[PDB]
């Protein structure tokens, strides 16, 4: 599913990211627009040959198992094919055990690079929440 912006927004919301470790909602949806473009179901091969996942992202060599990478971790104790889901749940449970891993949104490399330091709040302008 491909989701809208404000969409996701509520979405992320009703399920806890909102100021979740002190990052405001703009911070996961910038994110997940610079991951997925919104795409539940966006995959994309890393170099060291894992593979992420979903609306956020999620990558195989810790997070979830996909059956294909070598010498993973599996610390959402999850198949990689449940973060693609339309509901998103998985996707926002296992990226509060992401965020909560000492280094904070920095785990995300697009966040990292296309959100942090930028006025994120722009990323629920015009939404209801």
Known sequence: ???????????????????????????????????????????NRNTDGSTDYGILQINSRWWCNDGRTPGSRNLCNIPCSALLSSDITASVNCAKKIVSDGNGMNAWVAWRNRCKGTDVQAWIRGCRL
């Open 1 to 43: 599913k491909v989701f809208g912006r404000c969409e996701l927004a509520a979405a992320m919301k009703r399920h806890g990211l909102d100021n979740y470790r002190g990052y405001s909602l703009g911070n996961w949806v910038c994110a997940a627009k610079f991951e997925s473009n919104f795409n539940t179901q966006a995959t």
